[PDB]
Amino acid sequence: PELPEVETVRRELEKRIVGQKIISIEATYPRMVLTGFEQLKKELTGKTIQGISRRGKYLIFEIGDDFRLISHLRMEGKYRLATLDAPREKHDHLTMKFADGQLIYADVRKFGTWELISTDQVLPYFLKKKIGPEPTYEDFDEKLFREKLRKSTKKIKPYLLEQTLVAGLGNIYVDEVLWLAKIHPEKETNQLIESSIHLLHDSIIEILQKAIKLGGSSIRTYSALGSTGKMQNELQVYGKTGEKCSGCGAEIQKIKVAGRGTHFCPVCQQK
DNA sequence: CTCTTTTTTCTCG
DNA sequence: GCGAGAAACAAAGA
Ligand SMILES: [Zn+2]
């Protein structure tokens, strides 16, 4: 998932599990708990979920007075709320059981991670990760963004994916944002003029807030949290190879940029 | 059968 | 420090 999908999950969890006491925690894949599964089980069993937050693509469960469970879903992680008698599915790894149901984490590729840290360690954790600002008008300052782009000779798509200029874009929304901003993904950032940077900055905020409003991009639904999104119906370029650009009618092309599949319009995003 | 495809963080040179 | 490539892992498609 990217930031809009994780935000969608965050909102659903906030609505459904806040206030629930964790009765037990079980793992069939305990090695994805990077701070130690048995330690987590001992610390969190019997505690109550107080809140769910998000920073960039990270989910943050607020548990008990002092605990923060930092969850990254990476490429394929999925949460679902299930009955206590629900059958095991193949790639289920962890479950938090409550009195009336359970929260199951599944991840086919086993890339996702859990880390248990304390409340006063959350801000240092994300400083160490060097996560950039949230993609909001209030936090994403165009002036610093502009100065960083001016200084660099990185290509814009890989630099955006780093999470350091702004948090939250992954391959789908970086491709969408660069099409909306009319910028080619291989453009060296120190070649961007001020008006392009301004359109890029606003397009990042607008696309991600649109995607959040639509419940993220689900391809497809899965019975999991966040699986009823509608943003996939709004994609202009990602996965649209060979289809016609809605802006000019050129075929959308796919290339590889720094190892990643990259979808763009060659007319609207001049090299 | 092989090769390719689909977030973060490493090695290598 | 950089970029290129790939590991972590599983599955599906050519
Ligand atoms: Zn076009």
Numbering used by the authors: 1 to 271
Sentences from the paper on this structure:
The Fpg/Nei superfamily (also called H2TH superfamily) includes bi-functional enzymes able to remove a wide variety of oxidized bases. The enzyme architecture consists in two globular domains connected by a flexible hinge: (i) a N-terminal domain rich in β-structures containing a highly conserved N-terminal α-helix (αA) displaying generally a proline (P1) at the N-terminal involved in catalysis and (ii) a C-terminal domain rich in α-structures containing both DNA binding domains of the enzyme (the H2TH motif and a β-hairpin domain structured in most cases as a Zinc finger). All these enzymes feature AP lyase activity consisting in the successive cleavage at the 3’ and then at the 5’ sides of the abasic (AP) site according to β,δ-elimination. In this work, we deciphered at the atomic level the structural and/or functional determinants required for the specific inhibition of ZnF Fpg/Nei DNA glycosylases by the uncompetitive inhibitor 2TX.
